[PDB]
Nucleic acid binder design. Structure first.
Lengths: 591, 134, 229, 37, 166, 37, 123
RNA sequence: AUACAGUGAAACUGCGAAGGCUCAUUAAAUCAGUUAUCGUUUAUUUGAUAGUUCCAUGGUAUAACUGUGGUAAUUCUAGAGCUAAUACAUGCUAAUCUCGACCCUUUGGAAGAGAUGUAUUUAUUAGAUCAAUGUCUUCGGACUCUUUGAUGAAAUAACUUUUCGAAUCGCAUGGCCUUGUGCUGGCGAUGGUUCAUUCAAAUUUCUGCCCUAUCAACUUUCGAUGGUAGGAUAGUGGCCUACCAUGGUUUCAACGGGUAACGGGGAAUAAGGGUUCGAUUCCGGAGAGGGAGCCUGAGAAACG
């Protein structure tokens, strides 16, 4: 008969709204008691009478789900629903602790709340009943103790009711009457917030606009309290950033920066949070990261600091200038952030950024020589913008070489901090050399020569565009250096980049031989570069299977010579992974 | 191609090559005795049959061993007895003279073809025959 | 009318006992009548082996299973209550069913080759063996042709033997049926003559199939005891 | 008749309390294998 | 039907002298029950133990599926206009699998007006049938084997995929 | 067009029926003066 | 790529893998070809054995006629008369096989009256 | 033994018969092994395997049986009267599962929110990451490209004339005091849905002893060869039909010619001397007067 009544519900829509409201009115007239319970509360209730009431709430749920647009709603059905919900609350909170009929009437009450939320799920902007405050005060006096009750990952009876009441136009009258956002913000600022906290945050972010478009001054102060909740909930959207739904945070922070500027410490906290929005997770997308940096700039245009947020915005621009993502949109937002950071370093940054980012002109090569002849003492964002131009951004090749040489000149004129800046230059040149670049690899080689300012002739002859006598002199220089972990790793990386699967050129056997000779000359340095030799042999072993295995086989055979010389010298090690790699070679032998 | 379980090649045959002249020479040069009966006990029907041949007393010993071993008398199964007992006793009185069967001397069956002249150790190399001697 | 595996003497009868259906196949099993009556000879005829089956002395795989033609296949531990008879029967080197005698701590378990692992219904991992013990929930690293160890009091897998290069394997099938020695070679082809190869006294070589071979332990330590000569 | 109504209901609730608990009792062993894997 | 065997016909080599055998039970070809529109009558035939097979002949209540949301709802049948597995099958107006048949789409109107409010994002050449009532939909289920008429609606790409044909 | 329109002669229908001499009760002149127009 | 009616489509663009040492080309993973009976996306599953040989004719579409000459140790007239075999095979979106072209095939699920093999490799 | 109580003609029941003769001549297509069926049926064997409840027990209609009879007559019959079910078919049925605001510290979970199947046939998708023994140590960390591992490349929207949530029994009075069968309460066989195995069958990969070119062409003349879709199927399948393409086999032996094909092929046992006698499965498929159509079953075009 459940399947039969489900068929009756699936065919219970064929009659008009008059007959649907008449059948709903007959369903309401079972145990309404509007003479007894339309004033305040009910007169009496029973277990089987609540079972008629639980069945009435279930029939209301089935009727609303069947006719989930119109539902034939009536104030008699509303009064019967309020009488049933109040009788469920009264019986559950007035019965003794025996829990059988109490859990029956509690699962009657949760299902009745689900059927009540179904009415607003079906007929939301259709009725908007003007006597809402009766049921609103009834449900408030029932669920006053539901302060932090709806704070969970699945608690969505009163949380969904609050979201429905907040996502309307004029049904927020019961919200702005006394309180909805107070208890919602209490459970939102609860510290054990699960991932419905983002749902409540998006609901309040969408519901601040109705409280702002409302002409009532009470709703204006409630919108002020929603901005105050956005300022007092400065840990929830931080700690709940476990998914890629950071567009809600970027949509609230832009709304907050466009709406309310209430404290300089609040603007500094917003700028530091949007700095953590780019220094917290690397999976933030382009529009979200651009709007987050623009919201940090919008808080900084109002109430920024002069030293602390100055350095924070300078670090933000020093990351965003190395990024420059999304076809110069992030570069334009980074130039705006550097012009809003309000320092002397930021002033030189905005000058040397606007003088180069003038919409694809020769002003980039003009401004590189301009700041070279007029070298600025900030130099951090200058080295960022001149190392993005030294990377695979095609123009400013000689200007990139002059920028690296001028950074070396400043690092020699310092004579400590600018040597740690040269450490960052070397840690950038390492990832530049281990890459598929053509102009930026030559620029990193020029930076290696400027850091080297026999060895200088070797570097300039490795970057000589000749490659036959040049590679012969490189092999002879490796022989002279044989007769350095990261340094020889960088040299062998540049050599492997110049001979990296370029099988349209000859002497690849001597090129791999020079790679293995530099690897042997690094592996002779056992006290330092044994780890680097192990890493280079490991990367060559990964390349021995990664889609190409002709010259990598000879690289494996000639990197075995370091092991042969080490075993002849030993005449303790790690035999285990060596034997397992021997088993892997035996498996590659059965290919 | 592929393997196929062959009981006819891991079954104990040992009878294609069992020749009575070779077996008699082995019994002569055996240097361990032969379990012969007390002399009257092996004649059969008061002399109406033969004595009994060596294969017949071997088969009789096997039948009595199986007999005592699983407690069952053998039977008078008609088709097998009308073949084997009558044909066996008629060739017994044909060829068994005084407890000795002379049927083989009247039978064409080459000794060296099947039972001598080893097939696995054929030694078809001068080096293999040299290593087989030394 | 007999197979080769039963070690059945020819001077027995005319009709050979077809085993009934059961765990193993017809071609890889011996029933209880050819086990008890005419191999280790606890009976003399079918009437009295049915009599002792009605008396219920047999306790194969820890359950009684009173039936004459019950197909005891590979290493089903035949248990007999009187004189505490524990019999694990395996293959010899020339194709028959060598029934080794074992003790109680060894007959408290058996082992079984896994055939397939399934996501059958309702998220339940799943394992079958040659007696078809559909036991719940092994680890995810049960490949085909590994070896579970059944509990034999409940049904649970207690130990697990992984099939890889360097494991002690038993071959039941084809022209290698019943050999042990498991190491000269490994060769996994792509559809046939794919195996791990088995030594001899002079460490000779052999070819079989994957499904016709299954692991029993390690190089020197199988927890099954084996007969000798 | 009514004693059979006692025994039927008792064996039914005992069958439930055996099977529906043992099923989760080896599903938790699957959970242990998944945590250790 | 007759048969399922290669013995009555020639292979890829061209052989003769067939004269093979009395046909067995397991070459059982039943009669082709061309399912039509009528009053719902399903013949419950037996095969392979208790393998009851539902042979539908006059089925109506097609469960056809809204595609973009996957809403299989109940409707009637009108007629198949194009099905060149037999071009006389559409002349005789039967109902087989993978046929394109017409549906009065009034419960789909009810579901759209029930879970969207207003009446009429969806394509225009099916919005014309949203207005008129008869929409094209293709049968998925097998009434000759499973006895049912299920199907999927035509929505856009598959619509034009058939409308350019016929 | 293989099995389509075999213009052959078939065995059991070659004498399945037999004709009739007078046939139509009308005359052929009655046909001509029946549908001259 | 749609010359017939009745919703020419994959049957649940779609992509799978039979495994067992046979690659799937990138157009056969994500391409506009339907792969109704090509086993990489397909509806068929792989099993059985894998045979290798050159071809004779690829005249009709979805018909790859392999040749397969193989050694057999003849003891009768003690000389090897040379083998020849034929098998029709459905297409794959990986190689337009012309004359020559030693390729291999895997056994699966009889497609026409005489084809159980579908191409998985070209070399 | 005044509602049953042992013998038991004739009736329902469970099963029995669980595999027997003759006739016309098929060249790996009859047969034997083998590969596979996530391409499929399955009684029995074996291992596993069920959560939707509004204002003390459900209905006549038939036997056997009596009684009246017909007919030459049957395991042929018809009226009239009763009467039972594991026959027919309507219908009676406690509250336990996770996340846990709070914890009073161990006797730890009270509030709130989310739960709950099968059988049939339809669609979207769950089905790239983090942990170090190490890159730099700045003896702190952004760590995966290197050195090794891991989750990982049935959840839901509907039909169906939908099956069920034990009217089976045995062993054990046993525990409790809800003040009386108030709760019985412990276990095992038979049930009972589904999966897998086993059995058997059907297809299917390949292999296997006559001479054959005076058989050099066959195949489209039961689709020839393949593709697409449907029908039918236990399912794969030109197995059948619509449409389309003109294919496919062959001198590396297609296709065709016959018998000591009452003989042969291991089809199998071999025998301690018979060297093609010498153990057997099968010659081919049919047939129950003759073709045709239908039915039954886990299995059939049934020796019944």
């Amino acid at each position: 008969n459940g399947s039969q009544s489900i068929k009756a519900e699936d065919e219970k829509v064929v009659m008009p709204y008059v007959l649907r409201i008449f059948f709903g009115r007959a369903q309401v007239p079972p145990t309404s008691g509007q003479k007894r319970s339309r004033k305040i509360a009910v007169i009496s209730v029973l277990p089987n009478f609540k079972k008629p009431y639980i069945n009435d709430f279930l029939s209301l749920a089935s009727e609303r789900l069947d006719y989930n647009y119109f539902f034939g709603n009536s104030h008699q059905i509303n009064s019967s629903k309020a009488t049933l919900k109040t009788i469920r609350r009264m019986t559950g909170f007035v019965n003794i602790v025996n829990s059988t009929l109490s859990v029956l009437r509690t699962n009657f009450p949760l299902h009745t709340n689900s059927v009540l939320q179904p009415l607003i799920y079906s007929i939301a902007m259709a009725y908007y009943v003007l006597d809402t405050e009766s049921t609103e005060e009834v449900h408030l006096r029932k669920m006053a103790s539901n302060l932090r009750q709806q704070g969970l990952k699945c608690l969505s009876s009163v949380f969904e009711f609050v979201g429905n009441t907040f996502d309307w136009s004029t049904s927020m009258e019961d919200i702005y009457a006394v309180v909805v956002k107070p208890r919602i913000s209490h459970f939102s600022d609860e510290n054990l917030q699960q991932p419905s906290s983002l749902l409540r945050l998006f609901l309040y972010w969408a519901h601040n606009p109705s409280l702002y478009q409302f002409l009532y001054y009470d709703e204006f102060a409630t919108a002020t309290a929603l901005m105050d909740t956005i300022s007092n909930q400065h840990v929830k959207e931080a700690v709940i950033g476990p998914i890629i739904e950071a567009a809600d945070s970027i949509i609230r922070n832009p709304v907050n920066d466009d709406h309310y500027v209430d404290l300089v410490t609040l603007i500094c906290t917003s700028c530091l949070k949007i700095l953590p929005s780019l220094y917290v997770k690397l999976s933030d997308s382009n529009s979200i990261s651009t709007f987050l940096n623009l919201l940090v700039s919008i808080t900084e245009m109002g109430f920024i600091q002069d030293d602390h947020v100055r350095s924070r915005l300078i670090s933000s621009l020093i990351s965003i200038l190395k990024g420059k993502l999304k076809k110069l949109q992030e570069n334009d937002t980074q130039k705006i952030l550097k012009i809003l950071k309000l320092i002397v370093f930021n002033y030189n940054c905005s000058w040397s950024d606007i003088e180069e980012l003038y919409t694809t002109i020769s002003s980039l090569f003009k401004t590189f020589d301009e700041r070279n002849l007029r070298v600025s003492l900030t130099e951090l964002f200058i080295e960022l913008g001149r190392k993005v131009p030294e990377l695979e951004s095609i123009s400013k090749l000689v200007a990139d070489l002059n920028s690296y040489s001028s950074s070396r000149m400043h690092e020699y004129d310092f004579p400590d901090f600018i040597n740690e800046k040269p450490n960052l230059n070397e840690a950038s040149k390492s990832i530049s050399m281990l890459k598929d670049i053509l102009l930026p690899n030559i620029r990193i080689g020029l930076r290696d020569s400027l850091e080297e300012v026999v060895l200088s002739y070797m570097v300039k002859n490795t970057k000589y565009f000749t490659d036959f006598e040049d590679m012969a002199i490189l092999l002879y220089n490796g022989d002279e250096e044989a007769d350095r972990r990261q340094r020889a790793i960088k040299r062998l990386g540049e050599h492997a980049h110049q001979l990296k699967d370029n099988s349209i050129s000859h002497y690849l056997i001597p090129m791999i031989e020079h790679y293995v000779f530099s690897d042997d000359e690094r592996y002779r340095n056992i006290g330092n570069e044994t780890q680097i030799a192990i890493g280079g042999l490991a990367q060559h072993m990964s390349w021995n299977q990664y889609k190409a295995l002709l010259r990598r086989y000879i690289s494996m055979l000639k990197t075995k010579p370091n092991q042969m010389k080490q075993a002849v010298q030993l005449i303790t090690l790690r035999i285990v992974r060596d034997g397992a790699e021997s088993k892997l070679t035996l498996s590659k032998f059965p290919s | 191609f592929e393997d196929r379980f062959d009981a006819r090649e891991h079954k104990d045959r040992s009878n294609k090559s069992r020749m009575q002249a070779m077996e008699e020479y082995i019994r002569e040069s055996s240097d361990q005795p032969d379990w012969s009966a007390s002399i009257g006990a092996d004649i059969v029907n008061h002399g109406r049959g033969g004595i009994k041949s060596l294969r017949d007393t071997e088969k009789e010993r096997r039948v009595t061993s199986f007999e005592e071993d699983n407690f069952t008398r053998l039977n008078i199964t008609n088709k097998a007895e009308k073949r084997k007992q009558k044909q066996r006793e008629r060739n017994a009185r044909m060829n068994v003279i005084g407890g000795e069967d002379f049927g083989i001397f009247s039978s064409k069956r080459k000794l060296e073809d099947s039972t001598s002249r080893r097939g696995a150790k054929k030694t078809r190399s001068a080096w293999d025959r040299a290593q087989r001697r030394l | 009318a007999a197979p080769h595996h039963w070690l059945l003497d020819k001077l027995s009868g005319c009709y050979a006992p077809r085993p009934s259906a059961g765990p193993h196949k017809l071609r890889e099993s011996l029933p209880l009548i050819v086990f008890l009556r005419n191999r280790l000879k606890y009976a003399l005829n079918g009437r009295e082996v049915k009599a002792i089956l009605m008396q219920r002395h047999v306790k194969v795989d820890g359950k009684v299973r009173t039936d004459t033609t019950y197909p005891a296949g590979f290493m089903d531990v035949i248990t007999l209550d009187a004189t505490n008879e524990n019999f694990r029967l395996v293959y010899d080197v020339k194709g028959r069913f060598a029934v080794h005698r074992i003790t109680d701590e060894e007959a408290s378990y058996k082992l079984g080759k896994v055939k397939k692992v399934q996501l059958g219904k309702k998220g339940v991992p799943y394992v079958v063996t040659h007696d078809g013990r559909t036991i719940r929930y092994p680890d995810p690293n049960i490949k085909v042709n590994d070896t579970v160890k059944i509990d034999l009091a409940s049904g649970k897998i207690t130990d697990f033997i992984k099939f890889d290069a360097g494991k002690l394997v038993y071959v039941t099938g084809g022209r290698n049926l019943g050999r042990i020695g498991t190491i000269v070679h490994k060769e996994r082809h792509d559809g046939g003559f794919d195996l791990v190869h088995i030594k001899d006294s002079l460490d000779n070589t052999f070819v079989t199939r994957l499904n016709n071979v299954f692991v029993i332990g390690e190089q020197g330590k199988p927890y099954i005891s084996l007969p000798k000569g | 008749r009514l004693q059979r109504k006692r025994h039927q209901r008792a064996l039914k609730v005992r069958n439930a309390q055996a099977q529906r608990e043992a099923a989760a009792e080896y599903a938790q062993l699957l959970a242990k294998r998944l945590s250790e894997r | 039907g007759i048969s399922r065997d290669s013995r009555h016909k020639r292979s890829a080599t061209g052989a003769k002298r067939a004269q093979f055998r009395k046909k067995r039970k397991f070459e059982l070809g039943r009669q082709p029950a061309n399912t039509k529109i009528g009053a719902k009558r399903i013949h419950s035939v037996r095969t392979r133990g208790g393998n009851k097979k539902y042979r539908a002949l006059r089925i109506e209540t097609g469960n056809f599926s809204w595609a973009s949301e996957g809403i299989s709802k109940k409707t009637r049948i009108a007629g198949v206009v194009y099905h060149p597995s037999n071009n006389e099958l559409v002349r005789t107006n039967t109902l087989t699998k993978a046929a394109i048949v017409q549906i009065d789409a009034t419960p789909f109107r009810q579901w759209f007006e029930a879970h969207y409010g207003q009446t009429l994002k969806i394509e225009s050449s099916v919005e014309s049938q949203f207005s008129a009532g008869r929409l094209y939909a293709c049968i998925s289920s097998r009434p000759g084997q499973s006895g049912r008429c299920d199907g999927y609606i035509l929505e856009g790409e598959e619509l034009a995929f058939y409308l350019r044909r016929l | 067009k293989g099995r389509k329109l075999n213009y052959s002669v078939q065995d059991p229908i070659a004498n399945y029926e037999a004709p009739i001499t007078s046939g139509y009760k009308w005359s052929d002149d009655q046909i001509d003066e029946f549908f001259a127009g | 790529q749609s010359e017939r009616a009745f919703q020419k489509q994959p049957h649940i663009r779609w992509y799978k893998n039979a495994g067992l040492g046979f690659k799937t080309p990138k157009t056969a993973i994500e391409g506009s070809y339907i792969d109704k009976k090509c086993p990489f996306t397909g509806l068929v599953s792989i099993r059985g054995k894998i045979l290798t040989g050159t071809v004779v004719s690829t005249k009709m579409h979805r018909t790859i006629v392999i040749r397969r000459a193989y050694l057999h140790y003849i003891p009768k007239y003690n000389r090897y008369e040379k083998r020849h075999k034929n098998v029709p095979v459905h297409v794959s979106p990986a190689f337009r096989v012309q004359v020559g072209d030693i390729v291999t095939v895997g056994q699966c699920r009889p497609i026409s009256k005489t084809v159980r093999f579908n191409v998985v490799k070209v070399s």
